[PDB]
Design an enzyme around this catalytic site. Structure first.
Site, PDB file in Angstrom:
ATOM      1  N   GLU A  22       0.816  -1.217   0.000  1.00 27.28           N
ATOM      2  CA  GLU A  22       0.000   0.000   0.000  1.00 27.28           C
ATOM      3  C   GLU A  22       0.848   1.265   0.000  1.00 27.28           C
ATOM      4  O   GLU A  22       0.422   2.324  -0.475  1.00 27.28           O
ATOM      5  CB  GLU A  22      -0.919   0.012   1.222  1.00 27.28           C
ATOM      6  CG  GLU A  22      -1.928  -1.144   1.235  1.00 27.28           C
ATOM      7  CD  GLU A  22      -3.032  -1.045   0.178  1.00 27.28           C
ATOM      8  OE1 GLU A  22      -3.154  -0.026  -0.511  1.00 27.28           O
ATOM      9  OE2 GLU A  22      -3.801  -2.021   0.044  1.00 27.28           O
ATOM     10  N   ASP A  31      -5.735   6.415  -5.608  1.00 28.01           N
ATOM     11  CA  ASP A  31      -5.095   5.117  -5.864  1.00 28.01           C
ATOM     12  C   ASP A  31      -5.218   4.727  -7.337  1.00 28.01           C
ATOM     13  O   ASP A  31      -5.738   5.487  -8.160  1.00 28.01           O
ATOM     14  CB  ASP A  31      -5.640   4.015  -4.939  1.00 28.01           C
ATOM     15  CG  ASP A  31      -7.063   3.561  -5.298  1.00 28.01           C
ATOM     16  OD1 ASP A  31      -7.582   3.952  -6.366  1.00 28.01           O
ATOM     17  OD2 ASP A  31      -7.656   2.787  -4.502  1.00 28.01           O
TER      18      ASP A  31
END
EC number: 3.2.1.17
Length: 174
Positions: A22, A31
Site C-alpha cells: 500500500e 489510488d
C-alpha cells in the site's frame, strides 16, 4: 539461506506486508483505481475531494485538511487491519478457509480482505475451495484472472505469489 535470511521471516508480518503493498502517504492521493486514499491504503471514499476530506476528519478526529502524521497513519492502519481480521473471522464462508491456512497464507488472506473487502473476497468461490484444498498453483492462476489483480497489478501481485508459496519471498529485495 544465511543466518540473516532465516531471520527475515520473523521480521515479516501482516503490517509489514500491507505497508509494502500500500505504501505510506501522508496526504490525500488517488489510488490506481482513482479512489481517494491516505496513509497506508486507507480508502476514504469511492470523486469529490471534499467528501474525502470530511471522511478524513471523521476518521482521525481533528481538522486535518487532507494531511495526517505518520503516527496517525499507523493508528488508522492498525484499525483497518483489525477490521479485516474481524471481517474474516465472523464470516461463515471465509473463517473455515482462513483457519485451514498456514500463518503466512493467513497474512495474504487478511491482505486480500483489507484490499477488496469481505464480500468481494467471499465471492471468489473457486479460489476459496482451491485454498482449502491446498491447490496453491490453481488458486494463484485464478487470482490472476481477477479484476482486482488486473486493474492494479502492482498492489496485488505479491499477495498472489504469497498465496502460491506460503513464503515471504515476494517481499524480499525491494
Amino acid at each position: 539461506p544465511t543466518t540473516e535470511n532465516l531471520y527475515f521471516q520473523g521480521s515479516m508480518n501482516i503490517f509489514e506486508m500491507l505497508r509494502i503493498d500500500e505504501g505510506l502517504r501522508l496526504k490525500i492521493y488517488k489510488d490506481c483505481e482513482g479512489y481517494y486514499t491516505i496513509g497506508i491504503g486507507h480508502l476514504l471514499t469511492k470523486p469529490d475531494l471534499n467528501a474525502a476530506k470530511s471522511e478524513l476528519d471523521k476518521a482521525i478526529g481533528r481538522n486535518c485538511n487532507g494531511v495526517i502524521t505518520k503516527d496517525e497513519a499507523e493508528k488508522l492502519f492498525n484499525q483497518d487491519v483489525d477490521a479485516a481480521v474481524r471481517g474474516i473471522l465472523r464470516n461463515a464462508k471465509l473463517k473455515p478457509v482462513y483457519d485451514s491456512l498456514d500463518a503466512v497464507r493467513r497474512c495474504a488472506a487478511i491482505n486480500h480482505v483489507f484490499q477488496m473487502g469481505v464480500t468481494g473476497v467471499a465471492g471468489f468461490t473457486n479460489v476459496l475451495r482451491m485454498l482449502q484444498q491446498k491447490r496453491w498453483d490453481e488458486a494463484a492462476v485464478n487470482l490472476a484472472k481477477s479484476r482486482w489483480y488486473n486493474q492494479c497489478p502492482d498492489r496485488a501481485k505479491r499477495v498472489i505469489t504469497t498465496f502460491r508459496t506460503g513464503t515471504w519471498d515476494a517481499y524480499k529485495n525491494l
